[PDB]
RNA sequence: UCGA
DNA sequence: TATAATGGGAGCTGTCACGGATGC
DNA sequence: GCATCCGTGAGTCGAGG
């Protein structure tokens, strides 16, 4: 490895390490646009029932973290893993409907 | 055109090649063109015959070395981003004493750069010069001591890291006492040392009333050299036991040891001719048949001694006198390196003959060639006389391989350098440049060498003179140092002659640099030239002697910042110096021979010559410089044109018919304009455009990598994530972009494709994935854009690929892309323009053409230059330069004025004359009398006292005209400009420095490692530093909120400036700020230092700035 | 190191007022844009901020209507201008920003003998104060026509000099 | 709370055995392979903390 | 100044050489903790001499210190000032052995905590002004008269 | 009417040196050691140097770039000591109420020692203008008051009657004499210059004496 | 310069209270959507858009303006901040 | 006639009197005209113009 | 002051 | 090294 | 893991004012 | 009391490589 005071113009004026960028760290833009982005996907689960957007919450892990298996949120709520997956696919497409007529999430994918 | 000359002084001799104190330097330090045998013991055959031979095999010998040929030509390293270099193969033999066995052999000891035939290098592709150093020259001197008036010093001094500096000084208690690495010791011990018995130091130094007896001690006398000897080694080596061959061998090194102490052969010679003595050696003393035998020291105690007394004919010593201040070339600055990693290899050859098979050995075995190697990379790479090479026009090289620097390595420390070595000596006369040198903290210790001037095989700078015997002055011509030019009287070039004898019974003369008014019988020797006393860039500036010296400097300087025009053309006004520069330069290319043009083509020029071959000149066309600035030969001959030896083929850049073309030929009114010209600024008219007048090509590289990684390779692809046809639509196959197509910022060059870091989803990329159903892509888009406020059209491109022919990269990088993009820059606001006489500003304005200020006839002058720049700059050239250039503009002509022998005042106004009566009479012929507007104006000049009562109107235009002055119409108006404006030709070049690249702004962008503080420069897309003084300015304005925004948000607050572009984005006001990062940092720093710092609230109760994260 | 920064070469600004200063509109869309982000996103040129920026990238992507939208955001607002060596406080002035086109600043002639800039291809900084406060502060107290007099003699800094004197006594 | 102060003074052992989330006991700092912080190292994650977030 | 053309307001030559004086040196103790010879601020010991003149006890016997202006700014009280000046580490040592508490009285304390500076708009004189309307300070004043 | 006259009276451009130089005789020189050459230029810049002119002239030229290059980094540093010395007083209050002040002469002794003579107006003024009035002062049937902000008629007023020989010093409140804690009181420190009324409470003024002394340092030869 | 600043500053005893004033006025208008202010609809500032004169963007310009006004009531203590805050809130939800 | 002083001392006077607003409006008017005035002025510098007197 | 020559010393004290 |  | 081997080696030094410890 | 060595300082932004 190189050492990071290295002099590239000689000695006082600059260090080898001043011109390089911290990557790690998220740029304001960076964070803005996640914060923007879990806002919008609130105003999206928004727009469904709240067991519908609480099953999805926990089968994608935005609420404890994790992702739940079928069986979980299908204890949790208390009906059957076929009943949770179904509510999770209904979840889903209301979502795709949602989104193919608003159009509001479209341009965080990227 | 027409070239009238002037001037009545006939130049004996030409200017000397003008990059030969690059090129004689190089070559004499090489010998490569020399057999082995007739080589002599200067260069790197004096490394070696220094080094070799290495003892205790036993004895590792020299013989001889070759340089072999470089294994790629110059513009093939320019494009592989290699050295251009040739091998250097030694003959060495290693030799058993004992056994008597030899093996010999030829080993291999890595590459030595070469110099290219203009005088520059290229080192990993890029072109570099090494800039000589001025420094003290070796010798022994004497310096009045400064705290004892009265009392002196004497100072030996050898070459750089050749071996220390002695102090030799009469103390206070009457001692004489040697300073050596900072170590005071009575000279009486090494004197005794030396062999010498009082009864020699008593007939030898006696004459010299009491001084002798403070070198008088019988302690000393008391004792046999070898136990003065052991006494002078136990004084200069604490704790060291003082073994005998221990001591004998510290002072054979430190003093008579060639290997280790050498005087310059200028030394040398210094010293003999001021000690009036003769040095068998280079050293101090020697050591012959078991003992040391006095050179130096000796005759040194007896001219200080002599010096002390007041015995006349021996004197102090000007240090700053450029016979005792020398110049080390790039030979001998390479030549030094070259000694220093040969020892390095010596040490390595001693320490490889110590271990392994005492039997079997091979030099080869012995020899490490990477210590040298190293050691020659270094100094090509990172010394700092090694710079990167000015290419912006043919003249800034030339200028930067004649430069003179008393800085760098074995050179003076800024500190160090005062008021002395910054002064204009009297000794620079016709040796180093008075004019061209640095504005700023750099001032005085670069400059420039005389255009005559020549350093001798010494090191010292030589200026030409003409002897004169009897009052009659010869052709002969002799190059003194200054030493020797102290000793004539020496009249100046401009000494009235009358065939070949002086005319005047006064003549100017220095005596010592101090000018005197001597008659011819007294006059021994005279000036070549005017021009002999300045550099080439002072010499390229007409009616120098007008000028100040300062703003002459600014535009000697400036010259070399000018960018080559497409339609670049030479100046109306010239100093005749403007061929010379392109042909020394090699910017044009020549004809050989005399004989016929065979072919003539934009790539080529064939030539065949009287010998009735057939010789291909390919031209260089479209090349990008280290600056920039496009470098291309056009042809300027034409088929089957008869040319002769000498003759013009093509022009360089910034070349014109082989005359030198810096910039345009504009016609200019000086004259305030409506403020736009204010301070310095210039307006220009948009016919300067229209017709394409400082418009210049500029190349820009770009470059790329895709390189082999853990989580995967990087490849460069036509397929890009989340990209639309649009984005792509320039590409090739390969994800190169074509040539010929137009970017813009934000546009891709090189497509490129990496694989994403191991990455773990956050629950909205998890559910926005699934919402939108696609699969996250393996790779993302690293791909090489175009950066804010660049682009142009793609001239070229460069692939290199690993697996393929030729091709070799750096270990992991699979390959390379090269981008060309050039771009055809017009001129705007914004951009810096400059005459020769050291007038610069920035265009301000650029007027439509019917707002210009033009003349009766209709024709709109170019650019308006503000007369408020004038008289506290006293630069008056470009006044009488633009005259000339209105003379030349109806005439038709160009002039060539030379500094000090320029187109004096009655001349112009002949030629003025002539040029009115062009300017005028054709108007009288078209049937047109007098404007009414030209009658007041005339009326407003009768009473200016311009022109004289009673006179025709025609009659008092021509004064007006002899005056330089004509009859200006304001262009929105159609009303005159009330008085007669000076209107004329001026050589106007566009500098370097241009708003397009200097513009430069940020939002938000990259931040540093530790201190999580924007980024600086513009490449790096960074901040603008708010510094001390500016914190300063808010402090003192008071204003607490906008100090602690810069403070806080702006740069180093994460969560400060997180949430203020987000409440931005949201349209909200920006919040509250929090803690600085990098006081954090200065904590935590402190905390490595076993400092406690707490940061306390009004009840001395400790607050966390880091919120429970740094405690347990 | 700052954000919300830019440079560029001066250049007479005789058109300007004291309070003035030609900023190119490059620069000003650079050092703005977060607030243009914003305004794009209130008028129809943009669904959202993230488009708006996207938008922005590349620069043929760049139309109109952004540019009427950038002058709506720097109304009434200043920018701070520099040059360095800073020597006392009125090394940094602040001015109403006119949008340019071209790449170089326009600077008042008055106050150009406070700045000790002059048109040899002097540079400045440009910045931008952000909150309402530093605003505030920026255009009751570090306004180039609010500080007429020396802080260090009391007389005028800003005073007729050069052609302006000339015609004056002409 | 507000900082209204700022005290420094000498650091005793036994406070900076109190700062300290662990002893450095190698001179290592990362992998030669694995790129990865070597235990008990300069850069290990035992001490300092995790390289990602939450992690 | 003046031989350069150049004009100068006697004012702040006066607080810059006002600073210069700050300094006072013991020619004796009386009845305080002082060392003969020590050297401290004339505010500090005015006020330990009034605290002993107002508890009946002996002055403190002081002279006036004339220092330059580097030696009075490495002199001051606040050690981050004095450290962010110069000779770093001897103000960091001394300090720190003092157990020493910077009360961030000074503009350069505050820009190194980025703080907002004691001067102008962060002048605890003018910092703590309220603005309000008519119609919201009578909608107030109701709300306050009506309890 | 003439261009250099005109730009040189109005004080647009030059001053008679330069102008001088253009027309009259270049001067004398100084050689490398200080010591000036006893032949001066005889030429002007109108009429041209000879080579030997320019380089006598060069010497002095180069002493004094090199001269204004090392003066720049000393000014600097001076500067920034001042700042360092000065940055923690603010004014702090509107009166420390303290009843002392300094007085400012309008008299000065002569070089000759013979008499005392009035102080040049623009001293005077550079000691007076925008000051508090500690003092009542009766002077040509004007009344100054105690706590009076001395405007610049004030001071054209009392150099007036020390003129006539009724005042022969004024006194005034001073920052030398501001009893403020950690800077100075408004009174003390009289008007912000800037303004020409009297100085805003929590103007930083420590920074500004500093600034103020600062930037002609480079001037200074 | 700023329109009416000489009076501006003739309201204040320290300039820089007129600044902390401005400012502050200005984030009260910006958080309430200026339907706060003291200003008469003739009296409103306006900038001049691409179709027509429109409000002015700009809540200093808001600020000073009806600081000039004499409207508004300045100094230090006039109210418990939280009850200014939650008043307001009431009077001009936002 | 008016020179650099008896403007400054006007740009003086009119601060005190009339206060920063009209001064900085005043200043803006004396930089237009006098830019105005000495654009049509006819002010050049020729080498003549620089007049060595015969009493040298 | 220097720790080599000092261990030199002190090794050839044994 | 270069620009202010 | 076993002949015997035992104290290093770089190294040009053209500035200046000050404060503080030290040396006669 | 007074020479002497040691450590400490010695302009700001910006560009290029
Ligand atoms: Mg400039
Ligand atoms: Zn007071």
Known sequence: ?110 | ?1112 | ?170 | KEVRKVRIALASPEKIRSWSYGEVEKPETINYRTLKPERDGLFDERIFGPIKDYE | ?147 | ?221 | ?94 | ?56 | ?14
């Open chain 8, 1 to 56: 006639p008016q020179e650099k002083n008896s403007l400054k001392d006007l740009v003086y006077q009119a601060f005190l009197r009339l206060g920063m607003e009209k001064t900085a409006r005043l200043l803006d008017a004396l930089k237009y005209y006098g830019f105005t005035f000495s654009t049509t002025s006819g002010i050049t510098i020729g080498i003549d113009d620089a007049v060595i007197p015969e009493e040298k």
């Open chain 7, 1 to 94: 310069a700023e329109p009416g600043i000489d009076k501006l500053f003739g309201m204040v005893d320290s300039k820089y209270r007129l600044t902390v004033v401005v400012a502050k006025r200005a984030q009260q208008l910006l958080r309430h959507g200026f339907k706060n202010t003291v200003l008469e609809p003739e009296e409103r500032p306006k900038m001049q858009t691409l179709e027509g004169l429109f409000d002015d963007p700009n809540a200093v310009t808001w600020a000073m303006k009806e600081l000039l006004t004499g409207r508004l009531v300045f100094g230090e203590n006039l109210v418990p901040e939280d009850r200014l805050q939650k008043e307001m809130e009431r009077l001009y939800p936002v």
């Open chain 6, 1 to 221: 009417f003439n261009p250099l006259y005109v730009m040189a009276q109005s004080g647009a451009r030059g001053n008679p040196q330069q102008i001088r130089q253009l027309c009259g005789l270049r001067g004398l020189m100084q050689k490398p050691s200080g010591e000036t050459f006893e032949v001066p230029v005889r030429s002007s810049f109108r009429e041209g140097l000879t080579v030997l002119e320019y380089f006598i002239s060069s010497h002095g030229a180069r002493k004094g770039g090199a001269d204004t290059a090392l003066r720049t980094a000393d000014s600097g540093y001076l500067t920034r000591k001042l700042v360092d010395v000065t940055h923690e007083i603010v004014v702090r209050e509107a009166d420390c109420g303290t009843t002392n002040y300094i007085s400012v002469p309008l008299f000065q002794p002569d070089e000759v020692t013979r008499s005392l003579r009035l102080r040049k107006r623009a001293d005077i003024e550079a000691g007076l203008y925008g000051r508090v009035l500690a003092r009542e002062v009766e002077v040509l049937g004007v009344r100054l008051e105690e706590g009076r902000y001395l405007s610049m008629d004030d001071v054209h007023l009392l150099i007036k009657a020390a003129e006539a020989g009724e005042i022969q010093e004024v006194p005034v409140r001073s920052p030398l004499t501001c009893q403020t804690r950690y800077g100075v009181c408004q009174k003390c420190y009289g008007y912000d210059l800037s303004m020409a009324r009297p100085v805003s409470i929590g103007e930083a003024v420590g920074i500004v004496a500093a600034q103020s002394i600062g930037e002609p340092g480079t001037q200074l030869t």
């Open chain 9, 1 to 14: 002051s220097d720790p080599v020559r000092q261990y030199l010393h002190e090794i050839g004290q044994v």
């Open chain 2, 1 to 1112: 055109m027409e070239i009238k000359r002037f001037g009545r002084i006939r130049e004996v001799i030409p200017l000397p090649p003008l990059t030969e104190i690059q090129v004689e330097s190089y070559r004499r330090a090489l010998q490569a063109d020399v057999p082995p045998e007739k080589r002599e013991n200067v260069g790197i055959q004096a490394a070696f015959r220094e080094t070799f031979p290495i003892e205790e095999g036993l004895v590792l010998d020299f013989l001889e070395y070759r340089l072999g040929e470089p294994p790629f030509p110059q513009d093939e390293c320019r494009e592989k981003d290699l050295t251009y270099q040739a091998p250097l193969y030694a003959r060495l033999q290693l030799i058993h004493k004992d056994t008597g066995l030899i093996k010999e052999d030829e080993v291999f000891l890595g590459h030595i750069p070469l110099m290219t035939e203009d005088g520059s290098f290229i080192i990993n592709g890029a072109d570099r010069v090494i800039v000589s150093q001025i420094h003290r020259s070796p010798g022994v001197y004497f310096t009045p001591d400064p705290a004892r008036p009265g009392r002196y010093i004497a100072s030996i001094i050898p070459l750089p890291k050749r071996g220390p500096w002695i102090d030799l000084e009469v103390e206070p208690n009457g001692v004489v006492s040697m300073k050596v690495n900072k170590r005071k010791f009575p000279l009486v011990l090494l004197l005794r040392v030396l062999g010498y018995d009082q009864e020699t130091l008593a007939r030898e130094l006696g004459a010299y009333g009491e001084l002798v007896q403070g070198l008088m001690d019988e302690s000393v006398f008391a004792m046999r050299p070898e136990e003065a000897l052991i006494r002078l080694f136990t004084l200069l080596r604490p704790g060291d036991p003082p073994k005998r061959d221990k001591a004998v061998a510290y002072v054979y090194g430190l003093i008579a040891d060639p290997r280790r102490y050498d005087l310059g052969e200028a030394g040398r010679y210094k010293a003999e001719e001021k000690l009036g003595i003769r040095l068998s050696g280079r050293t101090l003393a020697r050591f012959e048949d078991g003992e040391f035998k006095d050179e130096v020291f000796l005759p040194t105690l007896r001219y200080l001694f002599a010096l002390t007394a007041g015995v006349p004919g021996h004197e102090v010593d000007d240090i700053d006198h450029l016979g005792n201040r020398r110049i080390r070339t790039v030979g001998e600055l390479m030549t030094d390196q070259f000694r220093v990693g040969l020892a390095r290899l010596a040490r390595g050859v001693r320490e490889r003959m110590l271990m392994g098979s005492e039997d079997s050995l091979t030099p080869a075995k012995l020899v490490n060639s990477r210590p040298l190697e190293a050691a020659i990379r270094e100094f090509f790479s990172r010394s700092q006389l090694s710079q990167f090479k000015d290419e912006t026009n043919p003249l800034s090289s030339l200028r930067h391989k004649r430069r003179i620097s008393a800085l760098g390595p074995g050179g003076l420390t800024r500190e160090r350098a005062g008021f002395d070595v910054r002064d204009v000596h009297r000794t620079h006369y016709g040796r180093i440049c008075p004019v061209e040198t640095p504005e700023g903290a750099n001032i005085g210790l670069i400059t420039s060498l005389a255009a005559y001037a020549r350093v001798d095989e010494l090191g010292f700078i030589r200026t030409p003179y003409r002897r004169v015997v009897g009052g009659v002055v010869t052709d002969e011509v002799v190059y003194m140092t200054a030493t020797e030019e102290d000793r004539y009287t020496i009249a100046q070039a401009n000494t009235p002659l009358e065939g070949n004898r002086i005319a005047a019974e006064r003549v100017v003369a220095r005596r010592k640099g101090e000018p005197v008014i001597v008659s011819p019988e007294e006059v021994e020797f005279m000036d070549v030239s005017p021009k002999q006393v300045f550099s080439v860039n002072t010499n390229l500036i007409p009616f120098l002697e007008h000028d100040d010296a300062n703003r002459a400097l600014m535009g000697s300087n400036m010259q070399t910042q000018a960018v080559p025009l497409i339609r670049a053309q030479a100046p109306v006004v010239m100093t005749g110096l403007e061929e010379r520069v392109v042909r020394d330069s090699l910017a044009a290319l020549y004809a050989e021979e005399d004989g016929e043009v065979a072919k003539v083509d934009g790539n080529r020029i064939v030539v065949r010559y009287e010998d009735g071959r057939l010789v291909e000149y390919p031209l260089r066309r479209f090349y990008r410089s280290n600056q920039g600035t496009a470098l291309d030969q056009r042809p300027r001959v034409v088929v089957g044109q008869r040319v002769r030896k000498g003759d013009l083929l093509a022009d360089g850049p910034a070349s014109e018919n082989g005359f030198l073309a810096l910039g345009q030929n504009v016609l200019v009114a000086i004259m305030p304009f409506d403020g736009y010209n204010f301070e310095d600024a210039i307006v220009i008219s948009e016919e300067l455009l229209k017709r394409d007048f400082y418009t210049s090509i500029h190349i820009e590289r770009y470059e790329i990598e895709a390189r082999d990684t853990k989580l995967g390779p990087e490849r460069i692809t036509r397929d890009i994530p989340h990209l639309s046809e649009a984005a792509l639509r320039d590409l090739d196959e390969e994800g190169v972009v074509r040539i010929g197509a137009e970017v813009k910022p934000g546009d891709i060059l090189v497509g490129r494709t990496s694989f994403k870091g191991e990455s773990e989803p956050t629950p909205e990329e998890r559910l926005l994935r699934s919402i939108f159903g696609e699969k996250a892509r393996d790779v993302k888009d690293t791909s090489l854009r175009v950066p804010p406020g660049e682009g142009g059209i793609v001239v070229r491109t460069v692939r290199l690929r690993r697996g393929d022919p030729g091709v070799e990269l750096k270990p992991g990088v699979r390959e390379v892309v090269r981008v060309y993009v050039a771009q055809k820059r017009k001129l705007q606001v914004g951009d810096k323009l400059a005459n020769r006489h050291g007038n610069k500003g920035v265009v301000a304005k650029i007027l439509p053409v019917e707002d210009m200020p033009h003349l009766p006839d209709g024709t709109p002058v170019d650019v308006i230059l503000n007369p408020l720049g004038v008289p506290s700059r006293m630069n008056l050239g470009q006044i009488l330069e633009t005259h000339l250039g209105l003379a030349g503009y109806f005439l038709g002509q160009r002039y060539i004025s030379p500094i000090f022998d320029g187109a004096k005042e009655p001349e112009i106004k002949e030629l003025l004359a002539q040029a009115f009566e062009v300017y005028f009479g054709k108007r009288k012929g078209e049937g047109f009398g007098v404007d009414k507007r030209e009658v007041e104006v005339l009326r407003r000049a009768e009473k200016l006292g311009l022109v004289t009562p009673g006179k025709t109107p025609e009659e008092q235009l021509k004064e007006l005209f002899l005056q330089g002055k004509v009859v200006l119409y304001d262009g929105r108006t159609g009303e005159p400009i009330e008085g007669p404006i000076v209107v004329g030709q001026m050589f106007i070049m566009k500098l370097y420095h241009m708003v397009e690249d200097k513009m430069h702004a940020r939002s938000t962008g990259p931040y540093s490692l530790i201190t999580q503080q924007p980024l600086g420069g513009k490449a790096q897309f960074g901040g603008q530093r708010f510094g001390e003084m500016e914190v300063w300015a808010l402090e003192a304005y008071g204003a607490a909120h906008t100090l602690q925004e810069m403070l806080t948000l702006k740069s180093d607050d994460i969560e400060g400036r997180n949430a203020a572009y987000e409440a931005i984005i949201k349209g909200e006001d920006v919040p509250e700020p929090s803690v600085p990062e990098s006081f954090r940092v200065l904590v935590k720093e402190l905390q490595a230092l076993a400092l406690d710092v707490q940061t306390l609230d009004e009840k001395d109760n400790p607050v966390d700035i880091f919120e429970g994260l740094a405690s347990k």
């Open chain 5, 1 to 147: 100044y003046r031989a350069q053309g150049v004009k100068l307001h006697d004012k702040h030559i006066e607080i810059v050489v006002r600073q210069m004086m700050k300094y006072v040196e013991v020619t004796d103790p009386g009845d305080s903790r002082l060392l003969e010879g020590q050297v401290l601020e004339k505010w500090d010991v005015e006020a330990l001499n009034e605290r002993l003149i107002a508890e009946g006890k002996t002055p403190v016997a002081w002279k006036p210190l004339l220092m330059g202006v580097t030696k009075s700014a490495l002199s001051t009280k606040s050690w981050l000032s004095a450290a962010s000046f110069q000779n770093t580490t001897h103000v960091l040592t001394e300090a720190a052995i003092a157990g020493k508490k910077d009360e961030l009285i000074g503009l350069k304390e505050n820009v190194i905590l980025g703080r907002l500076i004691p001067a102008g708009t962060g002048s605890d004189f003018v910092r703590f002004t309220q603005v309000v309307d008519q119609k919201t300070l009578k909608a107030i004043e109701e709300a306050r008269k009506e309890a």
């Open chain 3, 1 to 170: 190191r700052v954000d919300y920064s830019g440079r560029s070469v001066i250049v007479v600004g005789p058109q300007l007022k004291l309070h003035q200063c030609g900023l190119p509109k490059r620069m000003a869309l650079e050092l703005f844009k977060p607030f243009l982000l914003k305004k794009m996103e209130e008028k129809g040129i943009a669904p959202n901020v993230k488009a708006a920026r996207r938008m922005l990238e590349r620069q043929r992507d760049i139309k109109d209507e952004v540019w009427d939208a950038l002058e709506e955001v720097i109304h009434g607002k200043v920018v701070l201008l520099n040059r360095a060596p800073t020597l006392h406080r009125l090394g940094i002035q602040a001015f109403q920003p006119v949008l340019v086109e071209g790449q170089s600043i326009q600077l008042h002639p008055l106050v150009c003998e406070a700045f000790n800039a002059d048109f040899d291809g002097d540079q400045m900084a440009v910045h931008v104060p952000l909150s309402s406060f530093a605003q505030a502060e920026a255009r009751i107290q570090m306004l180039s026509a609010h500080n007429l007099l020396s802080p260090a003699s009391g007389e005028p800094l800003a005073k007729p000099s050069r052609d302006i004197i000339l015609g004056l006594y002409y």
């Open chain 1, 1 to 110: 490895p190189v050492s990071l005071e290295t002099p590239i113009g000689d000695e006082k004026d600059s260090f080898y390490g001043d011109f390089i960028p911290d990557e790690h760290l998220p740029s304001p833009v960076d964070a803005a646009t996640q914060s923007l982005l879990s806002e919008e996907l609130e105003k999206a689960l928004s727009k469904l029932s709240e067991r519908e957007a609480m099953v999805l919450k926990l089968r994608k892990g935005l609420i404890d973290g994790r992702e739940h298996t079928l069986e979980e949120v299908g204890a949790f709520f208390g009906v059957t893993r076929e009943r949770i997956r179904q509510i999770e696919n209904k979840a889903l497409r209301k979502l795709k409907y949602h989104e193919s007529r608003t159009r509001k999430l479209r341009d965080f994918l990227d």
